[PDB]
Design a protein around this ligand. Structure first.
Ligand SMILES: [Eu+3]
Ligand SMILES: [Eu+3]
Ligand SMILES: [Eu+3]
Ligand SMILES: [Eu+3]
Ligand SMILES: [Eu+3]
Length: 106
């Protein structure tokens, strides 16, 4: 049921994030590491964005300089359980604010 579906969709999310930051071209230095399955993106100002799996809840969590956001699987989409906003939109907003330049995963 939900456990396999969660692993499938989260593994795809991890690869999309990693590959894009792998090919990051812009001026700002952005680094992405995977430690204990957790992704940590580090910006030149020392700020970070942290992305982890919450297995019991089948959620992906995002921790940014401004706050914490929790996402449910919704038809291949990841939706914030407090606001309805999409993961990609909230990640792009946070990364753009913390890099001081446009960061898109699209
Ligand atoms: Eu490549
Ligand atoms: Eu670097
Ligand atoms: Eu590195
Ligand atoms: Eu389970
Ligand atoms: Eu589909």
């Amino acid at each position: 049921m939900n456990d396999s579906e969660f692993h499938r969709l989260a593994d795809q999310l991890w690869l999309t994030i990693e590959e894009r930051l792998d090919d990051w071209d812009g001026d700002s230095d952005i680094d992405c590491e995977i430690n204990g399955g957790v992704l940590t993106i580090t910006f030149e100002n020392g700020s970070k964005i942290i992305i982890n799996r919450q297995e019991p809840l089948h959620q992906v969590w995002l921790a940014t300089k401004q706050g914490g956001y929790h996402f449910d699987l919704k038809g291949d989409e990841w939706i914030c359980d407090r606001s309805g906003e999409t993961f990609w939109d909230l990640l792009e907003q946070a990364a753009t604010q913390q890099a001081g330049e446009t960061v898109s995963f699209r």
